[PDB]
């Protein structure tokens, strides 16, 4: 089987990140050299997504990058579910999930320190926008409109969503409490956003109007994450 | 709104585990007392599943029990995706996933130590069956048959599956590699097992015949996990 060292994996992710910066979506392939033969491999998207998904499982579960990853699997994207480690870190966790999709992984802890997330007040959208550049990201506040979300998802940029869970109790019903919350829209059906919710699961399906309208009284934006 | 202490959560879990031992499914409610007013609540299944799901998120991400859990959400079950942290701990990770469903959580690491999981051999089905009692579980080997899986899921007992991923490459295709593997069947449709795969995701759907026939040359069982 074929294995790729940490050094090649880091360089490969930086190239993927630099490519995505063009706003033209993911590349058709990723060339990498294996650590045992120093032979060139042309990974198709299901292969590099599978490789980096495997890298990200180890990284998230162990708190440190793997020294190498063997190519064993395929995947649709490199995203690995990652739950918030506190009741106030939904926003840095959503940013860390976005960082996986952009091939520029920053841990939840790294993101929380950069954003200034706090036990007292969580994270505001203003903190997210102003501080994400410290980690290499630019945040584009967009309309809470499925067409705008689709426009940036089609570029490979995931979209942080912000909403009051009590305002989605009846059109979704995941939550019985009253608090503001964040997730990562990483996909869409014809009717629902697919939300990686750091307190529930990677696959929470929200009807476009349910999520769009669940932020009365608060900033009327979503937040696309892209390379800066 | 309402909060439950660590002691209360441990007590409620013991009682859920003892109830499940009857083989008659989940209880219609779970009695719990809040740590603030010490008031009695009859949490319906979606509520006690939501409570312990939130507890298990904290426990899985932080490596320790939360001191309390606020009832904020509802869920279908308490399962939280937990990925393997080595390339050889799929079996103890699947047993750990099962332990969440049985309300007797044991970490991947605890399961690995008890099963005798090793870097060279991983874990054999006999090791799983022989050593699970150390953690409070009994393993029932069943035929590789969707009717048997459904019989035990209906009792609230999840089912560890074992297969050679290369044998499922044409009928499912998550893997390109060659190795033996374990996951946890926690649900079924009319045609598919729903597999929590510690190397891929909580929701991997295998056509019955695809998983059933994917262990040619190896032991022809699945492994029900139940309270001992």
UniProtKB/TrEMBL annotation, chains A, B:
Swiss-Prot/TrEMBL GO biological process terms: proteolysis
- Pfam families from the entry? Peptidase_C39
GO cellular component annotations, sorted alphabetically? membrane
Q: What is this protein called?
A: Endoisopeptidase PeiR
Question: What are the cysteine partners in each disulfide bond?
Answer: 171-210
Q: Which segments constitute the Peptidase C39 domain?
A: 83-204
Q: Which GO terms describe its molecular function?
A: ATP binding; peptidase activity
Top-level lineage group: Archaea
